[PDB]
Symmetry: D2
Subunit: 385 residues, 4 copies
């Protein structure tokens, strides 16, 4: 289960670089130079890295310092063959963003947030990124009167519309991906799930430029089924990028390595991504636990990729097994894929077999055979066939 | 705090009529005749009632029995002045719907579900309903292989598109409202939140015919902020109807009387509905607990309306208080409502005050004053001003 | 992975016998004769069955009917070699128990609940049961004023103390096991977790007679770590019985087959039970989903046992692997098992290496190596070593 | 609603002193001198303050610096009349505690944790504290193999037993209070709820020295009913101290001001504490949100006390209202307080009215009248009587 760059595994600089500061504790690891992270990840078989502006260029750097930081990073990419498929903006760490970036109540902060974002879009394009992610982690509230959500959504739309005008006017081939999260660090975050983000996109001026970047753990913080949400995003044509990690239920955002947390959900996710032909990066937004030293950081990162590859093998074996294909027919998955009424409304209304002469009791007595199907799926996951 | 029909309070027949059967227990109350429910609710000051097909006409009734049930109900409405603003279909109780109605794997069940729905749309129009609700309580799965969600969403779209074709072809002035719920009775339900439902509507052939019917307790079963979700639905122009009740956090669907559960969320909800000018019914989808006899049923129903009226008074006093209006300005709610960049993209890019000369530290030092504002809101809610 | 009676797998009559009635739907399966359930479970390799009084003897049966029901059941046990290791009382279905049994506000109901329980203790002993379970599913409240919890705990203690007096006076070799659940069907249930039940037992007059019967899904309905709770019960000497099933997070009680839900938690549970030498029944309290016909019921029951046996194999391989044993030492699990200060308090106070000369920075720099250990555990679970 | 020192309101130095650093953001406020906090809290009407060792004496201070910090603090207490009723140890911030203090896998860390605690017990006694709190925030795990929970509980017991030996040998009149929390910062924390902590205490060598310090938000992070848990702690005689705050459901630990979060739970909590005669400090463990400047810090702290006083008034009015007293009898709260069977086991067995001649249907038909009672409670809370 050895990863190669062809597997498209990518990691944020902030993942393996997380120093271990949590709400109750100081850092347990030293800061990593981005150049070292690029080299170590390349050795593990990664395809590329991603960054927030402030991960690569320290906040407040002069133009000359910014140039030197980019030049060093560029050489590490050239030395390793690593790519940069996605970039994003840090609109959450600095105290100025304490009430948000795009939806801060203060108008001057909203304008600053846009200018900070635009500067990093230029850099992202220069480095070859195809997707620009926005995680509005400070957009929200702890109390009901602090934020009129209709006005906030107007400001959020205004911001994204301006960014779309910018990329169109510059001729850039980049697209945007909105990352939902339900809460943390704000008591409630705006656009809290994949669904809310998909709905918001349809009210933008150029909806074709915008998709979603769902994260495993974030949907699970609302107790939602992550594979189901991904299926809706795929159905809408909006899965532009994905963040892979693990989460144990409804609690703080754990950002465990992929495969940890809900293992069966991870299996169904990989099955769906591979069956649907998702061709984007397999990006890990995870935190090596602060119990670990640097050897544990790299072990945790390697485990992300290993678990994806094991699950890919098991899901492929499941779908290829003739006994599973038989079970899928026994459970009428084939009938689910056929139109209910391709004959049309009038034919349905005139069809006595659909109502007047429908034997509801005979239909009700048919078992769905879902438990046998699910035990075949369990046996395949566990390698017990 | 006496309700009158002008307050637009409505109740489902299945609410006060719930006999108290739960997963672990038999019924504790006898069945109520719908005519009795109409008369008792009218005496309490309700404006109207709502129904599933099977609440009003026992499943399997002949055409002659169906006529007699409707005639009796019609006379009770005429005797009381009660209205019927909304109706819905029961696609969840009968065993034939064990894998869903519109998204059942069996094609013959999907066709039956559509025919059952269409027959009740005709009745709803005859009785004067303006909104037709769909709660897809059996649409979903307990296991990952049982339901291909992309195919299921195709079938769900097909069903709603056919219903839109039907109402358009008949010339009916009714609109549809989709009611989300995240789980229960299925392990995961399709379209689990307001956001997912809003996103789905935008892929229908005639999106203008469809909105949402959010329920307080359902969004709270995902730990989401119900007022925030309602604000997004209002922002999209899609709040066609609402179900009011209470829920204590993430657990089974409790359907407590409105005002129970999260009281502060109820306050912020009423503030939003009244401030936005929502003009639809204030519908209660609640269950009097099975500990209660019939006197307790009517006390619980009266409490729904009383709590709405108290909260309406307190929210109005909050918004009218000059000290609150001052606090809203101190917290820059006025600035949130002003455009970020009505001067346009180029002016923003050329504005040195937005980036090059922006004093981030001075902006960061400004307190938001949200805690003082929230304590004024608490004082108003509690009548402690 | 074929079960045999030596594996001690047991099932409640109410599990495979669940007819599929849920809060929103009618039964999808016919009732099973208990004699048929005994015969089918014996064929699958089960060791025994368990029952509520009302599962075996229909409520309200005369003494002569009760005798015939027991006689038939007895012959099925004799014909199959099946045992009855545990029995319990239904104090939740009948409307009389709508406010509880042992903690109902009405005193006459509390006395009836005790008499109903005592009659079934006699029957349980006659059938050879060694454990008598109490699940107080109706003990609790939906609202704060309805139940003074201190008085309710006095009544709960009084009830359990009287039951202990009864079994002691009769000379019975049976012990009691309290089953916690946090909510459902009551809004909050008294003794909601393993911890609360363990604490309550210590205030009974004869604590040695009472232990816990934890259920996987119930602790998970509070978001708790089930293996951790089982470890505390084992540490206290109080794990008298266990209910095995699956649950997907914080929602209604799903009672999925064992191995479904949180698969990694199931692995760690089996590892703990087998390592600790738990010798009681491996009892499944599960519901075959109502989508299933009778063939699916038996497939789901077989899957419970199969998943336990697979996980047992994988946990044993994990603990026996020399590379895992090395990793456990690298993570200092050996040091966790050694006393902190067997030298005593005074020696600790005089030990300068414990404070004055302790190198906190060198200790802080040591990685715990937990991620490598956890990936070995993942590889073993998945059969990818 | 003006607080005075007689109300026993206390605050941790770390509450109003929280600088606003969260997992995703830097501090938004400067550090507060403990002397300033004492003076400002005294002006607001607080009774006293509490501290972790490291809040008062910077980690790593020499003995001479430690003396100066204590002397300054002592003078501020003398100048203001403020008391110090409780103290605690920081066993969570420094990287050395990344795997715990008392249950760290490394034995040398466990010994250091004990020595650090003992030094602060001496200081707590010198300052007049009557309760010593232990919050084991780092005791736990992110993964299953990292921590053998039985061994960890042995180490936890060993640590608390040694602390009890220390205070007994020194003749100190201090008692210990264990503070549960289910998760955060560890994936799962040992002793996750009030119940688990109460059960653990009963296995200590001197259980009389140990009680609980429950926190509103922590029990709510498991979805539990906080007033119910407090009632069990009172019933056991173990409520030594309490932490008051607010929390919106199952998510990260919010530490909102008291009265925020679940307002009705706050009402029932105050009703219980006042009715039971709890005489300990009313301690606030809260964080003024990082949106606030220093004026907002003091407004948030004042709001904690104001909300307690409003709720105290409303709960007292509820219990004193003759209509409520009538409703309590109608709901049989009086019967709940009477023994089930003071006549004894034999009399119960011989009482035909308890079983043979008990009219189960007549008893089942009696309504509990809980909804009317709960609406009276709502009306009192809202001041709408
Ligand atoms: Mg995350
Ligand atoms: Mg992410
Ligand atoms: Mg509901
Ligand atoms: Mg509803
Ligand atoms: Mg269960
Ligand atoms: Mg059970
Ligand atoms: Mg807290
Ligand atoms: Mg605390
Ligand atoms: Na746009
Ligand atoms: Na996960
Ligand atoms: Na349509
Ligand atoms: Na609620
Ligand atoms: Na006893
Ligand atoms: Na589970
Ligand atoms: Na002790
Ligand atoms: Na709260």
């Amino acid at each position: 289960y050895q990863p190669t760059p062809e597997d498209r595994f990518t990691f944020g600089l902030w993942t393996v670089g997380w120093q271990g500061r949590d709400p109750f504790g100081d850092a347990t690891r030293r800061a990593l130079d981005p150049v070292e992270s690029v080299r170590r990840l390349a050795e593990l078989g990664a395809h590329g890295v991603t960054f927030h502006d402030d991960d690569l260029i320290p906040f407040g750097s002069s133009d000359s310092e910014r140039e030197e930081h980019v030049k060093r990073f560029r050489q590490a990419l050239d030395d390793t063959g690593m790519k940069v498929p996605m970039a994003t903006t840090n609109l959450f760490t600095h105290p100025v963003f304490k009430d948000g970036g795009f939806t801060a109540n203060d108008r001057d902060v909203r304008r600053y947030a846009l200018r900070k974002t635009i500067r990093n879009i230029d850099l992202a394009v220069e480095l070859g990124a195809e997707t620009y992610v926005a995680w509005g982690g400070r957009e929200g509230a702890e109390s009901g009167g602090a934020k009129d959500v209709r006005d906030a959504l107007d400001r959020m739309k205004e911001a994204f519309d301006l960014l779309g005008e910018y990329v169109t006017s510059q001729g850039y081939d980049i697209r945007f991906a909105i990352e939902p999260k339900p809460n943390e660090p704000r008591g409630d975050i705006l656009l809290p799930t994949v669904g809310h983000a998909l709905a918001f996109i349809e009210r933008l001026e150029r909806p074709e430029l915008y998709g979603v970047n769902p994260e495993v753990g974030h949907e699970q913080m609302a107790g939602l089924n992550f594979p189901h949400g991904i299926a809706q995003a795929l159905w809408a044509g909006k899965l532009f990028h994905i963040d892979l990690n693990g989460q144990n239920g409804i609690k703080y955002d754990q950002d465990l390595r992929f495969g940890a947390g809900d293992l069966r959900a991870a299996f169904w996710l990989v099955d769906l991504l591979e069956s649907a032909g998702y061709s984007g990066p397999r990006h890990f937004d995870f935190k090596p636990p602060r119990t670990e030293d640097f050897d544990g950081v790299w072990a945790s990162a390697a485990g992300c990729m290993r678990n994806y590859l094991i699950l890919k093998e098991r899901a492929a074996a499941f779908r290829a097994d003739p006994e599973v294909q038989e079970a899928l027919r026994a459970s009428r998955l084939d009938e689910l894929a056929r139109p209910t009424a391709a004959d049309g409304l009038q034919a349905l209304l005139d069809d006595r077999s659909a109502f007047e002469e429908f034997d509801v009791d005979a239909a009700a007595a048919r078992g769905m055979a879902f438990e046998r199907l699910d035990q075949l799926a369990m046996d395949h996951l566990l390698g017990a066939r």
